[PDB]
């Protein structure tokens, strides 16, 4: 699998051969003949390249990728510079700046520095047609990223999952709460953010739960 980190490839390559995956791939290939599709191919799997699958400590389940030019690059809630951070990410930055001492808005929305630390930024759907939100919904990606979530559920201990919104919540509704930390609240979108997200303190709670679990905390500031 091209542009797909080898440590991940190692454990997940069982999917590439299932019929849904082969179909998924053929679909996206055909899609790229008629349409610009985001992320470009080398960035569909950025999340498999920022860190080894065993360095994963925090998981944040997202939806689909941003669907305009130079936005998506393989990480949920993340845009490439100089593209402004999306309104969800602005709210994540707001909660942080109350939640986390001396957190400053970093003036950009590249979450690469979180990724490198073993924060997995996993969208449920990994491609999209340019300018058509949800256009690759229900074509196989959901089963593929479900598998990623299962591999993680079954092959690790004491991850912190951050489940924002009912969607991400249903996606995570099978994580073993005996072996893994699951923190839930409203989606940070401006539309729903005042229903739980502001004041959830998830970034500090994660850090406490990581410290508690014998692992090194997330430097949430290591963007700036």
């Amino acid at each position: 699998m091209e542009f797909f980190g080898e440590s991940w490839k190692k454990h997940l390559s069982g999917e590439f051969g299932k019929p849904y995956f082969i179909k998924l791939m053929g679909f996206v290939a055909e899609e790229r003949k008629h349409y610009t599709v985001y992320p470009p191919p080398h960035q569909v799997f950025t999340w498999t390249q920022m860190c080894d699958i065993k360095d994963v400590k925090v998981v944040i389940l997202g939806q689909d990728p941003y669907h305009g030019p130079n936005q998506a690059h393989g990480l949920c809630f993340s845009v490439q510079r100089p593209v402004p951070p999306p309104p969800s990410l602005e709210n994540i930055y707001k909660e942080l700046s109350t939640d986390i001492e001396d957190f400053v808005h970093p003036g950009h929305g590249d979450l690469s520095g979180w990724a490198k630390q073993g924060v997995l930024l996993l969208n449920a759907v990994l491609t999209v047609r340019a300018h058509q939100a949800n256009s690759h919904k229900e074509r196989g990606w959901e089963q593929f990223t479900d598998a990623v979530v299962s591999w993680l559920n079954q092959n690790s201990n004491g991850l912190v999952f951050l489940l924002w919104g009912s969607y991400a919540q249903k996606k995570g509704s099978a994580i073993d709460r005996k072996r893994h930390h699951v923190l839930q609240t409203a989606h940070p979108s401006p539309l729903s953010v005042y229903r739980g997200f502001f004041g959830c303190r998830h970034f500090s709670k994660t850090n406490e739960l990581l410290q508690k679990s014998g692992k090194k905390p997330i430097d949430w500031k290591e963007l700036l």
């Binding site: 669907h67 009912s166 979108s189 729903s192």
Partner: protein, 109 residues
């Protein structure tokens, strides 16, 4: 002229924004209960329905804390509006999957 583009025109007029600033979109699925004023979410109507949401942003929208949005149920138009500096939703359109409750789309010209 797309709906999107009409709402941009109204919003740039209403709020004195740059006419040609590039707008981007954020698109999020969520139950209507978590998204709409109480008085608009009712059982057998919107309640417990998944909406497709579009929220528009740019630098000056960020700076003004104005977030225009359009809501869909499946492919049915459910709402056109904006969130403001204070977090009040204001609507130019709202339909409860049965019938329009609010229709001020004429302001979009």
């Amino acid at each position: 002229m797309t709906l999107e583009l009409q709402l941009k025109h109204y919003i740039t007029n209403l709020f004195n924004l740059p006419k040609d600033e590039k707008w981007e979109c954020e698109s999020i699925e969520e139950i209507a209960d978590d998204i709409l004023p109480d008085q608009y979410v009712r059982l057998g109507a919107l309640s417990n329905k998944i909406l497709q949401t579009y929220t528009y942003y740019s630098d000056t929208l960020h700076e003004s804390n104005i977030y225009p949005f359009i809501l869909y149920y499946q492919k049915q138009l459910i709402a056109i509006g904006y969130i403001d500096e204070n977090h009040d939703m204001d609507f130019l359109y709202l339909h409860n999957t049965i019938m329009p409750l609010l229709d001020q789309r004429y302001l979009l010209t």
